[model samples]
Target: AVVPIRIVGDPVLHTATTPVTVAADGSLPADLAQLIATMYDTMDAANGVGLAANQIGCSLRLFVYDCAADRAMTARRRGVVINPVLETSEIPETMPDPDTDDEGCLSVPGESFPTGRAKWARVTGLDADGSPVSIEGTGLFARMLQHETGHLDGFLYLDRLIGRYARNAKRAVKSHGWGVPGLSWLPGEDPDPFGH
Candidate 1:
């Protein structure tokens, strides 16, 4: 099923999610396959490249990703990554020159902001079952990897916001009702939270 995406100010969005585990059988455990399937549907519905379990109000260290249209430089996709760990490049990521390189979030809703994202990354984790999962790539795929990992750690791209954009986003959060805990924005209907 397509679970409702949580908005900003929700506690789950700001908490480090719990890890996944296997049962005594040492086999792939749980019905996570179903949840993972629903996760893809949810991400696709929101036109998002990634979604964390917390975004769906689940307190689990999990996320899904699809980097098809993003074109940061590569293509990648994921079903479910539980307790993901991100390995970023040594070089610090500077903001992209072209404003078009900005990123957006389904939780934040309506606003897209330019944020520093690693040019490449290596993601390591399990698939909820006993199997190991890994992904390594550059461009938007790297950003997608980092972003989802952060979500599992109670951080948002907005948390990485800097300078003037930072202050403005704070003001807009309230103005757009994004600061309200229980308020959820509908995709497509919600425009840029700040302004176009």
Candidate 2:
């Protein structure tokens, strides 16, 4: 089933998610399979490339992604990450390239802003089947990895914006009357709140 995605104002989106439980026999709990499956449906239905558990109001440490191999990378990746721990190359000293590094989120719903991200990122976690998994990427894919991880850690991409970008995002959220509780929109049902 496709559930409504929580907006930035929801407490669930602001709170750190709990780690998913792994059985003593090294298997995932039965219900997580359902959640992961629904997450993919919800993400795809919303026309999103990546989505975190909390975005669907499930405060569990996991996310799903279906990133196409764009110009920066060659391999198309699609999978889930459970209880992820993220590592990045370094703090990029240079300013972001607005053309490529701009980002948006389903939670924030409609504005894409230039946010600086590391050149490379890797996340180590367990996969849906309870085996250990590690995924890494560069360029846009790297930004996706970092963005999804931050969601589990309780941050919207808007929180990472700075300077003019930060101010602009804040203004947009205010103008849209977001940043409050109980706000959400169903994919393929509701009009985009920001009209983007």
The 10-residue segment of model 2 with minimum total lDDT is: 68-77
Error of 2 at 88 (Å): 0.4
Model 2 vs. true fold: TM: 0.92
Q: Please identify model 2 stretches exceeding 4 Å from their true place.
A: 70-76, 192-196
lDDT of each: 0.75, 0.86
Clash pairs (backbone) in predicted model 2: none
Whole-structure CA lDDT of model 1? 0.75
Question: What's the C-alpha lDDT at position 115 in model 2?
Answer: 90
Please name the candidate that would achieve the greatest lDDT relative to the true structure.
Answer: 2
Per-residue lDDT of 48 in model 2: 83
**Model 2 C-alpha lDDT per residue in residues 10-40, reported as the tens digit of each score:** 9999989999998788888888889999999
